[PDB]
Design an enzyme around this catalytic site. Structure first.
Site, PDB file in Angstrom:
ATOM      1  N   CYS B 107     -81.764  59.728 -12.574  1.00 38.97           N
ATOM      2  CA  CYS B 107     -80.467  60.350 -12.809  1.00 38.97           C
ATOM      3  C   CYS B 107     -80.254  60.555 -14.302  1.00 38.97           C
ATOM      4  O   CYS B 107     -80.258  59.592 -15.072  1.00 38.97           O
ATOM      5  CB  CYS B 107     -79.324  59.504 -12.217  1.00 38.97           C
ATOM      6  SG  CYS B 107     -77.693  60.224 -12.619  1.00 38.97           S
ATOM      7  N   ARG B 110     -76.373  59.235 -16.170  1.00 41.92           N
ATOM      8  CA  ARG B 110     -76.000  57.830 -16.106  1.00 41.92           C
ATOM      9  C   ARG B 110     -75.198  57.329 -17.301  1.00 41.92           C
ATOM     10  O   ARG B 110     -74.767  56.170 -17.264  1.00 41.92           O
ATOM     11  CB  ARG B 110     -77.237  56.960 -15.962  1.00 41.92           C
ATOM     12  CG  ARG B 110     -77.799  56.909 -14.561  1.00 41.92           C
ATOM     13  CD  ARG B 110     -79.002  55.999 -14.562  1.00 41.92           C
ATOM     14  NE  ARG B 110     -80.184  56.706 -15.090  1.00 41.92           N
ATOM     15  CZ  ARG B 110     -81.305  56.101 -15.471  1.00 41.92           C
ATOM     16  NH1 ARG B 110     -81.399  54.783 -15.419  1.00 41.92           N
ATOM     17  NH2 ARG B 110     -82.335  56.820 -15.915  1.00 41.92           N
ATOM     18  N   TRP B 279     -70.469  65.523 -10.977  1.00 39.54           N
ATOM     19  CA  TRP B 279     -70.333  66.946 -11.249  1.00 39.54           C
ATOM     20  C   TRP B 279     -71.721  67.515 -11.564  1.00 39.54           C
ATOM     21  O   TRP B 279     -72.665  66.782 -11.863  1.00 39.54           O
ATOM     22  CB  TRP B 279     -69.361  67.223 -12.402  1.00 39.54           C
ATOM     23  CG  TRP B 279     -69.696  66.488 -13.651  1.00 39.54           C
ATOM     24  CD1 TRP B 279     -70.620  66.853 -14.614  1.00 39.54           C
ATOM     25  CD2 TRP B 279     -69.129  65.255 -14.088  1.00 39.54           C
ATOM     26  NE1 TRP B 279     -70.644  65.914 -15.620  1.00 39.54           N
ATOM     27  CE2 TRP B 279     -69.737  64.925 -15.323  1.00 39.54           C
ATOM     28  CE3 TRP B 279     -68.155  64.388 -13.555  1.00 39.54           C
ATOM     29  CZ2 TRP B 279     -69.405  63.772 -16.030  1.00 39.54           C
ATOM     30  CZ3 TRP B 279     -67.829  63.249 -14.262  1.00 39.54           C
ATOM     31  CH2 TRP B 279     -68.448  62.951 -15.490  1.00 39.54           C
ATOM     32  N   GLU B 284     -79.043  72.597 -11.801  1.00 42.04           N
ATOM     33  CA  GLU B 284     -79.148  72.214 -10.395  1.00 42.04           C
ATOM     34  C   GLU B 284     -78.701  73.314  -9.455  1.00 42.04           C
ATOM     35  O   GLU B 284     -79.099  73.311  -8.288  1.00 42.04           O
ATOM     36  CB  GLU B 284     -78.304  70.994 -10.093  1.00 42.04           C
ATOM     37  CG  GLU B 284     -78.709  69.728 -10.810  1.00 42.04           C
ATOM     38  CD  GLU B 284     -77.727  68.618 -10.473  1.00 42.04           C
ATOM     39  OE1 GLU B 284     -77.970  67.918  -9.480  1.00 42.04           O
ATOM     40  OE2 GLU B 284     -76.726  68.471 -11.197  1.00 42.04           O
TER      41      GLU B 284
HETATM   42  C1  HEM Z   1     -71.408  62.833 -13.020  1.00 42.19           C
HETATM   43  C2  HEM Z   1     -72.404  63.656 -13.381  1.00 42.19           C
HETATM   44  C3  HEM Z   1     -73.851  63.505 -12.837  1.00 42.19           C
HETATM   45  C4  HEM Z   1     -74.843  64.323 -13.216  1.00 42.19           C
HETATM   46  C5  HEM Z   1     -74.661  65.486 -14.204  1.00 42.19           C
HETATM   47  C6  HEM Z   1     -76.048  63.924 -12.528  1.00 42.19           C
HETATM   48  C7  HEM Z   1     -77.289  64.521 -12.625  1.00 42.19           C
HETATM   49  C8  HEM Z   1     -78.395  64.273 -11.838  1.00 42.19           C
HETATM   50  C9  HEM Z   1     -79.585  65.113 -11.742  1.00 42.19           C
HETATM   51  C10 HEM Z   1     -79.780  66.450 -12.475  1.00 42.19           C
HETATM   52  C11 HEM Z   1     -80.449  64.528 -10.906  1.00 42.19           C
HETATM   53  C12 HEM Z   1     -81.828  65.089 -10.492  1.00 42.19           C
HETATM   54  C13 HEM Z   1     -81.716  65.635  -9.069  1.00 42.19           C
HETATM   55  C14 HEM Z   1     -82.236  67.050  -9.008  1.00 42.19           C
HETATM   56  O1  HEM Z   1     -82.463  67.645 -10.084  1.00 42.19           O
HETATM   57  O2  HEM Z   1     -82.411  67.591  -7.889  1.00 42.19           O
HETATM   58  C15 HEM Z   1     -79.838  63.290 -10.436  1.00 42.19           C
HETATM   59  C16 HEM Z   1     -80.376  62.364  -9.566  1.00 42.19           C
HETATM   60  C17 HEM Z   1     -79.683  61.272  -9.050  1.00 42.19           C
HETATM   61  N1  HEM Z   1     -78.357  60.928  -9.309  1.00 42.19           N
HETATM   62 FE1  HEM Z   1     -77.126  61.615 -10.750  1.00 42.19          FE
HETATM   63  N2  HEM Z   1     -75.749  62.827 -11.723  1.00 42.19           N
HETATM   64  C18 HEM Z   1     -74.397  62.544 -11.892  1.00 42.19           C
HETATM   65  C19 HEM Z   1     -73.704  61.531 -11.245  1.00 42.19           C
HETATM   66  C20 HEM Z   1     -74.208  60.613 -10.361  1.00 42.19           C
HETATM   67  C21 HEM Z   1     -73.464  59.590  -9.630  1.00 42.19           C
HETATM   68  C22 HEM Z   1     -71.912  59.405  -9.736  1.00 42.19           C
HETATM   69  C23 HEM Z   1     -74.355  58.923  -8.859  1.00 42.19           C
HETATM   70  C24 HEM Z   1     -74.132  57.725  -7.909  1.00 42.19           C
HETATM   71  C25 HEM Z   1     -73.089  56.907  -8.047  1.00 42.19           C
HETATM   72  C26 HEM Z   1     -75.678  59.481  -9.102  1.00 42.19           C
HETATM   73  C27 HEM Z   1     -76.862  59.086  -8.527  1.00 42.19           C
HETATM   74  C28 HEM Z   1     -78.066  59.773  -8.581  1.00 42.19           C
HETATM   75  C29 HEM Z   1     -79.253  59.392  -7.861  1.00 42.19           C
HETATM   76  C30 HEM Z   1     -79.394  58.161  -6.936  1.00 42.19           C
HETATM   77  C31 HEM Z   1     -80.215  60.278  -8.137  1.00 42.19           C
HETATM   78  C32 HEM Z   1     -81.645  60.206  -7.566  1.00 42.19           C
HETATM   79  C33 HEM Z   1     -82.354  58.999  -8.186  1.00 42.19           C
HETATM   80  C34 HEM Z   1     -83.533  58.496  -7.383  1.00 42.19           C
HETATM   81  O3  HEM Z   1     -83.915  59.112  -6.346  1.00 42.19           O
HETATM   82  O4  HEM Z   1     -84.101  57.455  -7.807  1.00 42.19           O
HETATM   83  N3  HEM Z   1     -75.515  60.507  -9.985  1.00 42.19           N
HETATM   84  N4  HEM Z   1     -78.610  63.171 -11.048  1.00 42.19           N
HETATM   85  C1  LIG Z   2     -73.982  62.464  -7.748  1.00 38.23           C
HETATM   86  C2  LIG Z   2     -74.901  63.587  -8.198  1.00 38.23           C
HETATM   87  C3  LIG Z   2     -74.467  64.517  -9.126  1.00 38.23           C
HETATM   88  C4  LIG Z   2     -75.328  65.552  -9.525  1.00 38.23           C
HETATM   89  N1  LIG Z   2     -74.904  66.461 -10.435  1.00 38.23           N
HETATM   90  N2  LIG Z   2     -76.575  65.655  -8.999  1.00 38.23           N
HETATM   91  C5  LIG Z   2     -77.013  64.756  -8.090  1.00 38.23           C
HETATM   92  C6  LIG Z   2     -78.279  64.883  -7.536  1.00 38.23           C
HETATM   93  C7  LIG Z   2     -78.733  63.941  -6.616  1.00 38.23           C
HETATM   94  C8  LIG Z   2     -80.071  64.072  -5.984  1.00 38.23           C
HETATM   95  C9  LIG Z   2     -80.563  65.357  -5.783  1.00 38.23           C
HETATM   96  C10 LIG Z   2     -81.787  65.566  -5.161  1.00 38.23           C
HETATM   97  C11 LIG Z   2     -82.502  64.477  -4.696  1.00 38.23           C
HETATM   98  O1  LIG Z   2     -83.718  64.646  -4.079  1.00 38.23           O
HETATM   99  C12 LIG Z   2     -83.987  65.785  -3.263  1.00 38.23           C
HETATM  100  C13 LIG Z   2     -84.997  66.700  -3.950  1.00 38.23           C
HETATM  101  C14 LIG Z   2     -84.532  65.303  -1.923  1.00 38.23           C
HETATM  102  C15 LIG Z   2     -81.996  63.200  -4.870  1.00 38.23           C
HETATM  103  C16 LIG Z   2     -82.783  62.017  -4.362  1.00 38.23           C
HETATM  104  N3  LIG Z   2     -83.603  61.432  -5.439  1.00 38.23           N
HETATM  105  C17 LIG Z   2     -80.769  62.988  -5.488  1.00 38.23           C
HETATM  106  C18 LIG Z   2     -77.904  62.899  -6.218  1.00 38.23           C
HETATM  107  C19 LIG Z   2     -76.629  62.782  -6.745  1.00 38.23           C
HETATM  108  C20 LIG Z   2     -76.185  63.707  -7.678  1.00 38.23           C
END
Ligand code: HEM
Ligand SMILES: Cc1cc(N)nc2cc(-c3ccc(OC(C)C)c(CN)c3)ccc12
Ligand code: HEM
Ligand SMILES: Cc1cc(N)nc2cc(-c3ccc(OC(C)C)c(CN)c3)ccc12
Ligand SMILES: C[C@H](O)[C@H](O)[C@H]1CNc2nc(N)[nH]c(=O)c2N1
Ligand SMILES: C[C@H](O)[C@H](O)[C@H]1CNc2nc(N)[nH]c(=O)c2N1
Ligand SMILES: [Zn+2]
Lengths: 415, 408
Positions: B107, B110, B279, B284
Site C-alpha cells: 500500500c 500508508r 481515496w 488506479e
Molecule cells: C487513503 C488513500 C489510499 C491510497 C491512495 C492507497 C493506495 C493503494 C494502491 C495504489 C495500492 C496498489 C493496488 C493497485 O495498484 O491495484 C494499494 C494496496 C493496498 N491498500 Fe492502500 N491506499 C489507501 C488507503 C488504504 C486503506 C484505508 C487501507 C486499509 C485500511 C488500505 C489497504 C491496502 C491493502 C491491504 C493493499 C494491498 C496490500 C497487500 O495485498 O499486501 N489502503 N493501496
Molecule cells: C483502501 C484502498 C484505497 C485505494 N486507493 N486503493 C486500494 C487498492 C487496494 C487493492 C487493489 C488491488 C488488489 O489486488 C488485485 C490486483 C487483486 C489488492 C490486493 N493486494 C488491494 C485495496 C485498498 C485500496
C-alpha cells in the site's frame, strides 16, 4: 518440485523446473524478500579447492548442450581439466567452451529484457592480450564491428581470466562510450552527472578535458594488474545521434545528442569457476534507457524541466502530469532520431513483447527463464507493456555476469 | 542481519531492524525470489497469536509488563481455554485495524494509517444488518467528496460454517457484460461477478456504468442482493482540461475505492468481512481501470481522437494517450472537489512515511513491485528506493472467492 507463473492479462500459465538447476543464492529468505535491492552481496581470490566442482558442473552443462554427455570426449576433457587444475591451480577453456559460456551468461542474465538475441552474440577471444595498448586495440575493433555503421551487432570481448587476483585485467570505464561529467564550483554539473567521479580519475591520470557537455571519455585500461593507461577512442569509431523531435522544431536547440552503442564494461563474466574481470559486451539501446533514465532521471541530465518549459506546460502542481508529458516527448525524440539516422534502437513496447515470446519459448525448450520483474518492467508506461502482468521467477544460474567493485577502490598502485 | 536499504537518487541509507519481528513467510527462498508472484499461498495455535498481539498492543500504550497487561493476558488466556476463541476490546480492535493497514507492504497510501475510522459491526447478524452498516460506511467515507478512510468490521469467523462475507470485490464497481459480437460492455474485470448477480435475481440495466448490487452473506447463509442508494454513490464525469472532445467519450468513475474481499487478521482472529476504503490514486483509474487490455481498453480510441500515428509502436502513441487520460482523471476529480492524489504526490508522501517508520519504528515493509506506480515509474521517488518486504501482523490477507467455497 515444480513452480508455476501466471500471466494475469492472458491467463497463460508456465511451469518452471529450471530453478532446480540453480546454485547461487538470491539474497532472499522465507521471511524477507530483497527483490528490490540493487546489489545483493550475492550479485557481486578463488583457490584450486572449490574450482574443479565448478568446472565439472560447467563441462557437464556444455557436453549436454552438444549431446555428448558421458562421451569419451566429455570424460577425457574432465580428466584434462582435473590434471591442469591440480598442477597449474587454474585451467583454460577451449574456444568452443568460451563462446558457449559467454552466450549462456547472457541467456542467464535475469535483469536483461533483450535476451531473445542471446544466441546471436559475436564472441571475441582476447585472452592472448598482455598490455593496455593491446586492450585498446581489441576494444577499437569491438566498437567497429559492433557499430557496423548503425546496423548494430551484439558482441563481447573476453580478456584474460583472473589468476591470483593480483594480475587482473580491468576496463575502468563503466561503459566503453560515455560522456564526461564536470562538477562546477557553483555546484552545478556540466555533462553527465553519472560520470563525474570517473571523469575526475581520468583528469587525474592526465586526460586533458575538453570541458564540454558531450565529451566522449577516454578508455582507462588495466592489463595484468598494472596501473591503468589512458587511450582516446578514434572519434570516427564513435557513432553519435543528434536528438531532434518530429514535431517540435525547438527540440534540436537543446543541443542534445547520444551515442549509438551501449557497451557495458565493468562486469565480471564467470564460466566454470573462471573469472573474466574484463569482458566488455554491447548490443543496442532500448529507447527508454536514453530517454527516460539518461535524460530525465533527477540525478542525470535532467532536461525534463527545460522540455516542460518549452512545451508551456503547467509546472506549478505535479497533478498536471507535466513530468509524465515531457518524458514521453523526450522518448519520442530519442526513437525518432535513431530511426531517422538508421541506428538500431528498440522501443519498450517491442522489447517487452519480444521478451514474453522469448520467455515462453525458454519455459518450453529449457524448463524456465530466470527473470527480474523489478528490472524487466520498463521505467515508463509499465502496465501497458506485457511484462507488467507477467509473473516471473528470479534465481541465479551459471555461467553469469556479476558485479564487481570499481577498480579504483581495490587497486594497489604501482606509482 | 540488521539490514540496510539505500535510496540511489538521494544516497539516504536506512537501517531495518523491524523485519526481525516478522512472523509469516514471503514465499521466497535463498534459491528463488517470488517477489512478483501475485498471490503466494483454530484450537491449538490461538493463544501464542493472542499473546504476541497483546504484547505489542501493551507496548504501544507504554504499559508493557504492567498490572493491566498481565491481567489482560490471563483474562484472554482463560477465555480461549473455555470458549475456544476470544473477543477483542474495542481499543485493541482499533489498534489491530490501524496496524493491519500500517503493515500492508503493497500500500503506497500508508502515511495516513493512523487516521483510520473503525466501525465496530461485530453485533451484526443478517445481510440486511450488513447492508445498513455498509451504507453508513459509504456515506461516512464519501463525506460529499471530502473522502475519509474507514473500515467496518463484521463478526469474526468461528467454525468456517458461519462466515460473514461481502461477495463483491469492492463495495462500488461497474457491471460487465458479454456481448454477441464477442467482446464486453461495461467493465471486463467484473464479468463473472455481474453474471453471478444476474444468476441471483439482479435485473441488469446493461449500460457501461451500472453500479453493481451488494451480495451480502451473514452467518454463512446464502447471500442476498441489495441496491446501494444512488445518492450514496458519488461519481465524477471525466473531461479533459484542454481537449474539449474528451467529455464526448462519456466516461465517469466512482469516487470511493472500498475493497471488500480481503481478510483482516488480528491476534489470531480472522475477520472475513471487513470492507475498507480510502481515496483513489489517479493511476488506479486512468492507467489500470481504463487502459489495461483486460479492462476498459479505451487507449486506441483516445489516441485516434488525438490523431496520433497508431501504425507503429515507436511513435509512443499509447504512452501519449495514457498520460492524457490520467491528466483528465485528476482534472475531473479536482474540479469536482473529490479527493484524489496523483502518483507523484503519493510516492513522495510514501518516501516521507518510510523515513518516519524507520525513525520511529525501525522499518517499514514495502513491496517495490506494487509500490512503484504503473506509469512513469522511474521519475517517481520510489523507483530508486530499495525496499524490504516482510509480513507483519496484524494484517490484511487474501481469501478465496466465496462462490468457490460456499455450500448453497
Ligand atoms: C487513503 C488513500 C489510499 C491510497 C491512495 C492507497 C493506495 C493503494 C494502491 C495504489 C495500492 C496498489 C493496488 C493497485 O495498484 O491495484 C494499494 C494496496 C493496498 N491498500 Fe492502500 N491506499 C489507501 C488507503 C488504504 C486503506 C484505508 C487501507 C486499509 C485500511 C488500505 C489497504 C491496502 C491493502 C491491504 C493493499 C494491498 C496490500 C497487500 O495485498 O499486501 N489502503 N493501496
Ligand atoms: C483502501 C484502498 C484505497 C485505494 N486507493 N486503493 C486500494 C487498492 C487496494 C487493492 C487493489 C488491488 C488488489 O489486488 C488485485 C490486483 C487483486 C489488492 C490486493 N493486494 C488491494 C485495496 C485498498 C485500496
Ligand atoms: C541487444 C540488445 C539488448 C538490449 C535491448 C538490452 C537491454 C537491457 C536493459 C534495458 C537492461 C536493464 C538495465 C537498465 O535499464 O539499467 C539490461 C540489463 C542487462 N543486460 Fe541486456 N540488453 C541487450 C543486450 C545485451 C548483451 C549483448 C548482453 C551481454 C552479452 C547483455 C547483458 C545484460 C546484463 C548482464 C544486464 C544486467 C543483468 C543482471 O544484472 O542480472 N545485454 N539489458
Ligand atoms: C549490453 C546492453 C545493452 C543495453 N541496451 N543495455 C544494457 C544495460 C546493462 C546494464 C545497465 C545498467 C545496469 O545497472 C547499473 C545502474 C548498475 C546494469 C547492472 N546489471 C546493467 C548492461 C548491458 C546492456
Ligand atoms: C505480475 C505482477 O505481479 C502483477 O501484474 C502486479 C505487478 N504490480 C502491481 N502493482 C500494483 N500497484 N497493482 C497491481 O495490480 C500490480 N500487479
Ligand atoms: C531500488 C531499485 O531496485 C533500483 O532503482 C532499480 C529498480 N529497477 C531498475 N530497472 C532497470 N531496468 N534499471 C535500473 O537501473 C533499475 N534500478
Ligand atoms: Zn524475494
Amino acid at each position: 518440485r515444480f513452480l508455476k507463473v501466471k500471466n494475469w492479462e492472458t491467463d497463460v500459465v508456465l511451469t518452471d523446473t529450471l530453478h532446480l538447476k540453480s546454485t547461487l543464492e538470491t539474497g532472499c529468505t522465507e521471511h524477507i524478500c530483497m527483490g528490490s535491492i540493487m546489489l545483493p552481496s550475492q550479485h557481486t581470490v578463488r583457490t584450486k579447492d572449490q574450482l574443479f566442482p565448478l568446472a565439472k558442473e560447467f563441462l557437464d552443462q556444455y557436453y549436454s548442450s552438444i549431446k555428448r554427455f558421458g562421451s569419451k570426449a566429455h570424460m577425457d576433457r574432465l580428466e584434462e581439466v582435473n590434471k591442469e587444475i591440480e598442477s597449474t591451480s587454474t585451467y583454460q577453456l577451449k574456444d568452443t567452451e568460451l563462446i558457449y559460456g559467454a552466450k549462456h551468461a547472457w541467456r542467464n542474465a535475469s535483469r536483461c529484457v533483450g535476451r531473445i538475441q542471446w544466441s546471436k552474440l559475436q564472441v571475441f577471444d582476447a585472452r592472448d592480450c598482455t598490455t593496455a595498448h593491446g586492450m585498446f586495440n581489441y576494444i577499437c575493433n569491438h566498437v567497429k564491428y559492433a557499430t557496423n555503421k548503425g546496423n548494430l551487432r551484439s558482441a563481447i570481448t573476453i580478456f584474460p581470466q583472473r589468476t591470483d587476483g593480483k594480475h587482473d585485467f580491468r576496463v575502468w570505464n563503466s561503459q566503453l562510450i560515455r560522456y564526461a561529467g564536470y562538477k562546477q564550483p557553483d555546484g552545478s554539473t556540466l555533462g553527465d552527472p553519472a560520470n563525474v567521479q570517473f571523469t575526475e580519475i581520468c583528469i587525474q591520470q592526465g586526460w586533458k578535458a575538453p570541458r564540454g557537455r558531450f565529451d566522449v571519455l577516454p578508455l582507462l585500461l588495466q592489463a595484468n594488474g598494472n596501473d591503468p593507461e589512458l587511450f582516446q577512442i578514434p572519434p570516427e569509431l564513435v557513432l553519435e545521434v543528434p536528438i531532434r523531435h518530429p514535431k517540435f522544431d525547438w527540440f534540436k536547440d537543446l543541443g542534445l545528442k547520444w551515442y549509438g552503442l551501449p557497451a557495458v564494461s565493468n562486469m565480471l563474466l564467470e564460466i566454470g569457476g573462471l573469472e573474466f574481470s574484463a569482458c566488455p559486451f554491447s548490443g543496442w539501446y532500448m529507447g527508454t534507457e536514453i530517454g527516460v533514465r539518461d535524460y530525465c532521471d533527477n540525478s542525470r541530465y535532467n532536461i525534463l524541466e527545460e522540455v516542460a518549459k518549452k512545451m508551456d506546460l503547467d509546472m506549478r502542481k505535479t497533478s498536471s502530469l507535466w513530468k509524465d508529458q515531457a518524458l514521453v516527448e523526450i522518448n519520442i525524440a530519442v526513437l525518432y532520431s535513431f530511426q531517422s539516422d538508421k541506428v538500431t534502437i528498440v522501443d519498450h513496447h517491442s522489447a517487452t513483447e519480444s521478451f514474453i515470446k522469448h520467455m515462453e519459448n525458454e519455459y518450453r525448450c529449457r524448463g524456465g527463464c530466470p527473470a527480474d520483474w523489478v528490472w524487466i518492467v520498463p521505467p515508463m508506461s509499465g502496465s501497458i507493456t506485457p511484462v507488467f502482468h507477467q509473473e516471473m521467477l528470479n534465481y541465479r544460474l551459471t555461467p553469469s555476469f556479476e558485479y564487481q567493485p570499481d577498480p579504483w577502490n581495490t587497486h594497489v598502485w604501482k606509482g
